[PDB]
Amino acid sequence: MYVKLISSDGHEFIVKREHALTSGTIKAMLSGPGQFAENETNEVNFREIPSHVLSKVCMYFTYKVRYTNSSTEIPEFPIAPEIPLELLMAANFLDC
Amino acid sequence: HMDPEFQAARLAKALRELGQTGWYWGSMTVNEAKEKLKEAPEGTFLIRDSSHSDYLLTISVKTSAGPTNLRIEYQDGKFRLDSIICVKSKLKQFDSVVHLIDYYVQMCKDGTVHLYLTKPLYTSAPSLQHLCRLTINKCTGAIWGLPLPTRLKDYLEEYKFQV
Amino acid sequence: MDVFLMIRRHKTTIFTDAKESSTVFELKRIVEGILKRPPEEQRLYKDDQLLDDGKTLGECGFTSQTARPQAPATVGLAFRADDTFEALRIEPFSSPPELPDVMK
């Protein structure tokens, strides 16, 4: 099951729901008046997060959920110095 | 600075922030340390408990001859690498065990076997916020001159190391 | 053994994963369950090249160390009209703002 995360500039991002939920903020937004039907597709809209930031955020969710040191590949999540402050704001907001 | 109670403080503290990095692997056995690093690249290390009474932390790192283990000694209120290791650096004594690891990681990453300290093995996926921090601390050391909220600048102040 | 993809279309991006040995067809079945569209109405591109339904994702260039979670491999997706497929058109993400002099 997936959820749709839309950026400020109209970009939709579809990620596994359990992955997207590593964020408390998102869980909160999908509750209360943000609650969704039982079989309706979940969709959240961020108004202050651009696509080049929100896409990286989604990458983080996967990076996290599949984190493993016992692999033939040693985990790593490099961030471009030109999108960190904008990503720091996004992470402080999503809380993760 | 050299004092019985002052050294116990400096330690207890530097040992506190150590568990705030993610490279502390608790009571990881030696074989397990070998498993993790066995195939890792030269310079990949991690910190764990020493089954010895004179020192508290051990550094497991991958070298030319494979994974190795070596102390992190504390005396006269300063943290230094193992005695055995022939060290050639402008600085050999630090206050925080984390300050030590950082300095060397910057130098090394940038007499038989060679010894490097480059990539620490994180016990679990760090927070995105922290990775951003680590990323920013690598770019500059002048935080406040940035276009960030006065509070996030505070978050970047609670950890100044590049790893 | 796992390749981390990033399938894209008109301002639509799907972050998902499959086996380096699974086939291109199976990937379309994944896209099917996500965008409710049959495999015969799909066109998967990679570096602007139509992917063969029989080749494994590995035989196409996706590998365990080139398709990592931190940076997924891009896969182009073009749908079908009533007869002819649309042209593979992917929207670019917003550009990253200039780097503050301090961080250079």
Next chain:
Amino acid sequence: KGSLQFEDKWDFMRPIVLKLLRQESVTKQQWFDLFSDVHAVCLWDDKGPAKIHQALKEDILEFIKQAQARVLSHQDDTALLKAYIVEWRKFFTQCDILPKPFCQLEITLNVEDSIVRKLMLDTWNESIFSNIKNRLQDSAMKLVHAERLGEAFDSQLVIGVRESYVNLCSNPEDKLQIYRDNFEKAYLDSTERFYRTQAPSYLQQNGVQNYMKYADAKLKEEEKRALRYLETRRECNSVEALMECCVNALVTSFKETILAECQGMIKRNETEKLHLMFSLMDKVPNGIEPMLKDLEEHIISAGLADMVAAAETITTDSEKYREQLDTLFNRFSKLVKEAFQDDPRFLTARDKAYKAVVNDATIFKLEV
């Protein structure tokens, strides 16, 4: 970047805060957009968080006084509650919702330990509960006392009162304080009191064997409702305190008059009725100590009565002797299983009583 402060956003934000408080439909885009605004205001505005706390404090007060009016506008006690429970249902529900968007406010000054959620409940206590609470309680107990006399009402009325006492307690190191000292205690007393007169009356009108049938169906319903009305989600074991009460009222004070029918029922092998008696006397401390005697005393008694009465044949054969003891052991173990459900304590009872009969039926004896 163009600075956006409190005064810049609050005007677009506030309208939603009001809708949330009043439980008026808010669109998902507004829900989301709010989280974003709260966050922005907090990190970008120097005094941003501090103000949002003030603004909320105010707007929460207004709504409450609006509800205060709507509630207190009733003189009649039955309507004062009915009106409270309605305004409560809403507000209490919105307490788990309104705080959500302001979690960044917490870290600058969890949804349960929420400053906002706290400020919500507290402001509601000072304006509506703290005063008309007592009137609600005694008004709620009435509804319960009614249900016991066959009058069914909107159960959500006494519950709303419970939820109020449980959730609206300003005690820093004890949250069920006013729940125990007030609501619980009230429920316990109106209960014990109810039976202190209700029980004895049914005992003198029906049989002591009919009463056990009653004191049982009672303990059953009193425990079923005590589960919906008293606190259970939290850990207090209040439901237990109520039962100990019903048991000390419906059974402990009637044990001697109950156990007086023990030896009689055990003789007519009234397993059905003894099963019932065991079920109850098992709840009271030292409750079955006397049944364990009235049994091993009946065995010894009835056992040697079976032997001596049949001695005419038993004395001639060593096997007609054993058969008699066997017929008995099988007969008593029969009782024990059927009536006393083979309780390990009742088996020990038999095993000791029977083992006694064996050494008292001894007919033959030779010596040097």
